[PDB]
Ligand binder design. Structure first.
Ligand SMILES: Cc1cc2nc3c(=O)[nH]c(=O)nc-3n(C[C@H](O)[C@H](O)[C@H](O)CO)c2cc1C
Ligand SMILES: Cc1cc2nc3c(=O)[nH]c(=O)nc-3n(C[C@H](O)[C@H](O)[C@H](O)CO)c2cc1C
Ligand SMILES: Cc1cc2nc3c(=O)[nH]c(=O)nc-3n(C[C@H](O)[C@H](O)[C@H](O)CO)c2cc1C
Lengths: 265, 265, 265
C-alpha cells in the first residue's frame, strides 16, 4: 500500500482513525448491488484484463497458414478528490467529541452512485451489458395487492421448467411498496403473506430502479471482479487545508441469463 | 458519605431501613428519561466543570504574543427538605406493619419532575439545549391508524441515508395512544403491527411530552454526567419532629443530532 | 507530545539540540517570579478549569426545590511565532561553532515578560488578583541606610503577632540598592548588616517592581498551576526559511494574605 503516500501527511494516528471510521459506515448501507451478487477476490494493483475464451479469424481463404487474435475485457479505474481544514481538525487533541466532516460524506455518496449505475445499466465504451437489457424475460402485472401474489406464483413455474432451484428474492421500488401497504384494510399482515409464496424468501427495497424483479440465490450467475478495493490517499497541501482522494478498479459480467425475471407494472 | 450527618439523628437502624426502602420504589418508576440515554459514572462531591474543547481569542491584531481562554460547562446542585413525626415512627418497635409517610412521597414526586424538565426543555442560565429544540428534523403525520404506519416506513429511509443503524424506539403520549386503540375495530392486534415495522422494537408511553418521537439505540449520542447521586440526610430537630433533606449534582448534553426524528400531528 | 509536529520539519538531531539548548539558559535567569512561589505538577493538555469551592443561589424565596451553580477559575493559553534561515543553519555540519540565532532570543525575552506581568499585577478579564493589590499591609520607610534597618525590625514583630514563622526574604529594586551602597563610607559591610536582622535570610534584586517587599518561606501561600510547560513546535515553510512557535498554559492564586508586607519609600 506504499503507492498511497500516507506517511507524508501532517496528521496523527488518532486523526487517521477518525477519518477511516466514518466512511465505512456509509459504504455499508449505500452499496445496494453488493447484496445479491458474488465477489471474486482481489488480484492486485497490476491486473489489466480478463479473458473471454474465443478467437477471431483475420486471414484469407486460400492461405496455408491461418491466424487470429484472442479476446478479453478491460478494467475501469476511478479517482475523486476533496479538502479538509487543519485548525478544525486540531480540536480533537484538546478533547472535542464531534468534528465537522461534511465534504467527505458528500463525496462518498456521489462515488457510491457511480458503481450501481454500471451494474444496473451497463457501459457502452467498455463493452458491459447490464441487468435491465435482457428483454426476453418479461411478465405483465397489475396494481391491486392480489395481482402481485398471482404473478409470483406464475414466475415460480417458469423457474422450475428450466431446472433452476434455490432460495428466491424480490427487489422492488419504495413508493410502490408504500401504495401497496396503504391499499389494504386491517387484514392479515401483507409481509407474511408475501413471504409465504416465496417459500421463505426476502424483500429488498431500493431507490435505484423503477419496477420489480425476481432472482435466485443458488450461486454463480452474476460476477463482480475486483483488482483493488476502495482506498483513501494523500495529494498535497495549500496553506491551511489538505487534499485527499478515493480510488478503485473493477469490472462486471453476467453468466446465466435464466435466473432472472422482470415485472412490468 | 460523612458530609451527611446521619449518625447524629435519634433513630434506629430498622427505622432508617424503612425510610430508605420506600423512596427507591418510586424513583424506579417515575424517572422516564433514564430509560434511553447513557450514564457516565460518578466523579465525587468535588467535581465542578466539564470541558468542551475550544479556545476564544481575546487579543488584538498586531500584537506579538496572542492569548485566549478555555471553555466548559458548570454543574447543577439541588436540595429539598421535609419533616416527620416521632411518636408515629415509634410504633414500628411495638410491631405495626404500616406507618404514615405521605410527605416523603409528595416531595419525591416534585423532585422527579425537575430533572425531566431539564432533559426535555433545557436551561437558559446554565447553557443547556434540550431534545425538542432541534427543529430541522420534523415530519408531518395524521390521525388515522395507517398514517402512523406510513410515517414509520418513511423515517427509516432517512435513518439509512446517513449511515445510522441499530434497534429503534418510539416514544409517544398516552391519550393519543388510547384514541388510536379505540379507532380500530376487531382487526389484527395493533401492537404487533406496530412492532413489525420497527423490525423488532419497543414502545414507551409517558405524560411528559405532547407528540411523538423516534430514536436509535446503538450507543453514544446523549450523555448525562453525574457527580453525586440522589441522597438523604439530616438537618435539625424541633420538639416533636425531625427535618431531613434530599440532594444531587448533575449536567446533560447531546452529541450526534442525526439519531433523532420528531413527528408533528 | 505528538501534537507538536516535530518530525515533519527538515532538520537533523544536532540542529534540534542546538536550538533546544539556547532557550533553557535564558529562561533559567529571566523568570524572576519562580524563585519564591510554589509549583503544582502538570495535569496535561486537556485540563480546563480549577475549582473554588462555593455555590451561588439563583432560585426564589418560596419555592420547594432550590438550586444554584458551582464556581471555578479558567486557564490561559498562549502562542508566539518566529522564522529561521536554512543555508545559515547548514554550516553546523561543515563544522562552524557559532551560528546566528538572534530572533529566537528576542522572542524568548518578550515571552518572559508576559508571565511576570500577570503574577505581579493580575488580569481583569480572567479574574486574577496580584501581589501589589493588597493595600492593607503597608509600612512607611525612609532614604537613609538606618531607616531600612529600623523598618525590618518593625516588620518582624507584626509577623510574630499573627503566628507566622520561617525564613524571611527581601525583594528590592536595583537603582535604590545602588544608592544605598554609595551612601555609606567605608564602614562595616552593609550586606552582612542587612542579613543579620533577617536572622539569616536572602536578598533579591529585580527590575520588575519599583519599591520593596518582605515575605516568608515556610510553604503554601502562593500557588502557580500549570497544565503544560513551555514548548517549541513547527508550523510551515516558505522557500528559504522555516516557521516555529512557543506555547504554554497556566493560572495563579494567593491563599494566605498574612505572609506579605509592602514598604513605601
Ligand atoms: C491561541 C491560538 C491557537 C491556535 N491554534 C492553532 C491550532 O491548533 N492549529 C492551527 O492550525 N492553527 C492554530 N492557530 C492559528 C495559527 O497560529 C495561525 O493560523 C498561524 O500560526 C499564523 O502564522 C492558533 C492561533 C491562536 C492565536
Ligand atoms: C403511655 C405513653 C406512651 C408514650 N410513648 C411515646 C413514644 O413511644 N414516643 C414518643 O415520642 N412519645 C411518647 N409519648 C408521649 C411523651 O411521653 C410526651 O410527649 C412527653 O414525654 C411529654 O413530656 C407517650 C406518652 C404516653 C402517656
Ligand atoms: C556551492 C553552493 C553550496 C550551497 N549550499 C547550500 C546549503 O548547504 N544549504 C542551502 O540551503 N543552500 C545552499 N546553496 C544554495 C542553493 O543551492 C540554492 O539556493 C538553490 O539550490 C537554488 O535552486 C548552495 C549554493 C552553492 C552554489
Amino acid at each position: 500500500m506504499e503507492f498511497l503516500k500516507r506517511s507524508f501527511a501532517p496528521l496523527t494516528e488518532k486523526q487517521w482513525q477518525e477519518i477511516d471510521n466514518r466512511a465505512r459506515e456509509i459504504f455499508k448501507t449505500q452499496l445496494y448491488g453488493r447484496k445479491f451478487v458474488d465477489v471474486e477476490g482481489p488480484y492486485g494493483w497490476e491486473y489489466a484484463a480478463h479473458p473471454l475464451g474465443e478467437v477471431e479469424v483475420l486471414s484469407d481463404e486460400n492461405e496455408v497458414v491461418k491466424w487470429g487474435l484472442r479476446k478479453s475485457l478491460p478494467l475501469i479505474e476511478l479517482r475523486a478528490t476533496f479538502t479538509l481544514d487543519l485548525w478544525e481538525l486540531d480540536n480533537l487533541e484538546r478533547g472535542k467529541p464531534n468534528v465537522d466532516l461534511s465534504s467527505l460524506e458528500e463525496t462518498v455518496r456521489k462515488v457510491a452512485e457511480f458503481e450501481d449505475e454500471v451494474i444496473f445499466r451497463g457501459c457502452e465504451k467498455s463493452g458491459v451489458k447490464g441487468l435491465l437489457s435482457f428483454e426476453e424475460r418479461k411478465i405483465e402485472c397489475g396494481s391491486t395487492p392480489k395481482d402481485l401474489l398471482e404473478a409470483i406464483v406464475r414466475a415460480l413455474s417458469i423457474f422450475s421448467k428450466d431446472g433452476i432451484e434455490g432460495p428466491y428474492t424480490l427487489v422492488i421500488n419504495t413508493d410502490r411498496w408504500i401504495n401497496f401497504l396503504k391499499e389494504e384494510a386491517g387484514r392479515y399482515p401483507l409481509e407474511k403473506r408475501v413471504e409465504e409464496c416465496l417459500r421463505g424468501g426476502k424483500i429488498i427495497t431500493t431507490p435505484r430502479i423503477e419496477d420489480a424483479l425476481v432472482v435466485s440465490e443458488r450461486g454463480g450467475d452474476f460476477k463482480l471482479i475486483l483488482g483493488q478495493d476502495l482506498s483513501i490517499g494523500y495529494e498535497d497541501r495549500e496553506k491551511d487545508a489538505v487534499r485527499l482522494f478515493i480510488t478503485e478498479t473493477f469490472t462486471f459480467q453476467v453468466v446465466n441469463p435464466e435466473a432472472l425475471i422482470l415485472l412490468k407494472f
